[PDB]
C-alpha cells in the first residue's frame, strides 16, 4: 500500500524526496517479476520514463537503472515499458550522455531486445541499430560487451530484422569482435554471427563478404564449448 | 526431474511455467530419444493445452517445443496428433503473430513429412486453406516454411493432391516458380513435380495454371535438383 505514494513522489520538487522514492522504486524493480508487476499496477512506468527527457544526472542514472531492471521482466512487462514510451528516450541516451548512463541504457535495450520479434521491431523503429553498431568500437570494453549482447538479441529476430542490422553496418565490426581480447565479447559476437548465418542466402553472402569464414575457422579450436558449437553452426551455414 | 517439469506446465506462477517450458523445448530439440522421454513422461497433452488460453510468450515456447517433437519419427508424430495438436496449430495460422505463425507452419511441415494417414489428419484439421493463403501475404521466411509443408502434402495420395488443388494451391505455386528467392523456387518446383505425378485431370489443372512455360524456364537452371524436378514435371504434362 506504499507504492502509490512512491509514484506520487516521482513528481516532487524536493530532489531528496524524488531521489529517495526513485531508490525505493529501483530496489523493487530489481526484486523479480512479481515485484515489477507491483510497479506496473501502481502506474510507475509512465512517470519513471518521463524522468529521462528533462531531469538531472543523478535522477537519470537511477531512473535508467530501474528501467533496465523492469526490462528484465516477462514479455508482457517489456510491452508495458514500450507502451510507457521508453524506447525513444533510451535510444536518445546512447550518444551524448555519461558512460554510466550509456551503459545502463544499452543494458535496458538489450533486455527489451530479448522480447518477442514485434518488440525488436519497435527498437528498430526507435532507431536503435545505428547507435548500437557505433558502440561496438567507439566505447569502453564494458559498453562494447553490452552492445554486442543487444545486437545478438536483435539478430535472434526474423530475417527482415537481420536485414536491418546488415544495413546498419553490423557485420564488419561483429567479425572483428570474433578475435576480441575478451572471451565474453567473443561469446556474444559468435552467437550474433550464428544467428545471422541462419538467415537467407543473400545474408549468408554478406557474412562471407565481411570475412566471417577465416574468423570462425580460427574459433573451431576454441576451448569454450558454446563458442565452438556456434562457430561450427555458422561455418556449416556458410558452406552449402 | 521430468515428472516435476510436466507438473509445472499447469503452475499459476508464469516464471515457473516458462522455465519448465524452456527445459521441455531444450529436451524436444535433443533428438528422437529425448522426444521419447517427453512422450513417456506424459508431456504432450499439457503442452498442447497451453496453445488455447495462454499468453503470447507461453504460446511461442510451446509451439517451438511442438515443432521439435514433430521432427521425430512417424510414431512420435502420431503421439502428437493423438494429443490433439493439429486443430490448435492450424488455428494459429489465422490470427497469431508472424513469429508464432512461422513456428506453427514449421510444425505442420514436419507433421506433413509423416505418413499418408498423418497428411490426411492435417487435411481434416483444415490446414490447406490457411497454408495456401500464406503463399501470397506472408513474409519470405513464412513462405519458405509454407511451400515445404505444401510440397510434403503433395507427396501424398491422388485424393490428397486433389484437396490441395481444391484449396487453390496451383496458381500461387506456379507464381513461386519465378520467385526472387532461389530457396522458394526449389521448394515450389518440388511441390509442382509432386502434383505432376497425379492423375490426368490433375495434370490438366497444372496445364491450365500455366505450369508448362514456367517449368520450361527452369530447364536452364544451375541447380541440379531444380532441373530434375522441372524435367520430371514437364514429361508428365507432355506424356
Amino acid at each position: 500500500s506504499e507504492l502509490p505514494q512512491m509514484v506520487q513522489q516521482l513528481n516532487s520538487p524536493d530532489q531528496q524526496e524524488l531521489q529517495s522514492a526513485l531508490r525505493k522504486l529501483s530496489q523493487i524493480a530489481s526484486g523479480g517479476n512479481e515485484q515489477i508487476q507491483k510497479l506496473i499496477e501502481a502506474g510507475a512506468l509512465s512517470p519513471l520514463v518521463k524522468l529521462l527527457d528533462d531531469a538531472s544526472e543523478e535522477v537519470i542514472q537511477e531512473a535508467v537503472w530501474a528501467i533496465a531492471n523492469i526490462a528484465s521482466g516477462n514479455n508482457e512487462q517489456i510491452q508495458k515499458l514500450i507502451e510507457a514510451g521508453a524506447l525513444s528516450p533510451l535510444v536518445k541516451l546512447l550518444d551524448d550522455a555519461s558512460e554510466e548512463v550509456i551503459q545502463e541504457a544499452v543494458w535496458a535495450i538489450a533486455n527489451i531486445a530479448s522480447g518477442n520479434n514485434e518488440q525488436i521491431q519497435k527498437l528498430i523503429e526507435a532507431g536503435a541499430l545505428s547507435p548500437l553498431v557505433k558502440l561496438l568500437d567507439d566505447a569502453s570494453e564494458e559498453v562494447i560487451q553490452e552492445a554486442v549482447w543487444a545486437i545478438a538479441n536483435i539478430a535472434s529476430g526474423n530475417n527482415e530484422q537481420i536485414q536491418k542490422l546488415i544495413e546498419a553496418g553490423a557485420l564488419s565490426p561483429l567479425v572483428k569482435l570474433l578475435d576480441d581480447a575478451s572471451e565474453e565479447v567473443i561469446q556474444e559476437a559468435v552467437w550474433a554471427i550464428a544467428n545471422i548465418a541462419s538467415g537467407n542466402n543473400e545474408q549468408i553472402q554478406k557474412l562471407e563478404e565481411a570475412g566471417a569464414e577465416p574468423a570462425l575457422e580460427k574459433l573451431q579450436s576454441s576451448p569454450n564449448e558454446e563458442v565452438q558449437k556456434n562457430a561450427q553452426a555458422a561455418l556449416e551455414a556458410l558452406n552449402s | 526431474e521430468l515428472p516435476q517439469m510436466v507438473q509445472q506446465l499447469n503452475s499459476p506462477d508464469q516464471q515457473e511455467l516458462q522455465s519448465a517450458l524452456r527445459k521441455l523445448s531444450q529436451i524436444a530439440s535433443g533428438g528422437n530419444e529425448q522426444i521419447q522421454k517427453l512422450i513417456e513422461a506424459g508431456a504432450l497433452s499439457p503442452l498442447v493445452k497451453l496453445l488455447d488460453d495462454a499468453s503470447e510468450e507461453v504460446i511461442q515456447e510451446a509451439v517451438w517445443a511442438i515443432a521439435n517433437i514433430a521432427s521425430g519419427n512417424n510414431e512420435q508424430i502420431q503421439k502428437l496428433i493423438e494429443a490433439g495438436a493439429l486443430s490448435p496449430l492450424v488455428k494459429l495460422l489465422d490470427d497469431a503473430s508472424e513469429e508464432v505463425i512461422q513456428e506453427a507452419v514449421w510444425a505442420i511441415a514436419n507433421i506433413a513429412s509423416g505418413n499418408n494417414e498423418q497428411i490426411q489428419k492435417l487435411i481434416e484439421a483444415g490446414a490447406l486453406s490457411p497454408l495456401v493463403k500464406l503463399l501470397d501475404d506472408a513474409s519470405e521466411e513464412v513462405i519458405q516454411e509454407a511451400v515445404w509443408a505444401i510440397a510434403n502434402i503433395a507427396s501424398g495420395n491422388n485424393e490428397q493432391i486433389q484437396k490441395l488443388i481444391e484449396a487453390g494451391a496451383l496458381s500461387p505455386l506456379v507464381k513461386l516458380l519465378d520467385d526472387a528467392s532461389e530457396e522458394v523456387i526449389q521448394e515450389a518446383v518440388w511441390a509442382i513435380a509432386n502434383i505432376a505425378s497425379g492423375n490426368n485431370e490433375q495434370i490438366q489443372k497444372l496445364e491450365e495454371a500455366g505450369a508448362e512455360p514456367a517449368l520450361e524456364k527452369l530447364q536452364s537452371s544451375p541447380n541440379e535438383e531444380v532441373q530434375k524436378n522441372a524435367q520430371a514435371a514437364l514429361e508428365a504434362l507432355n506424356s
Partner: peptide
C-alpha cells in the same frame, strides 16, 4: 531447426 532466441 535452429534456436536463435536465448
Amino acid at each position: 531447426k535452429r534456436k536463435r532466441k536465448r
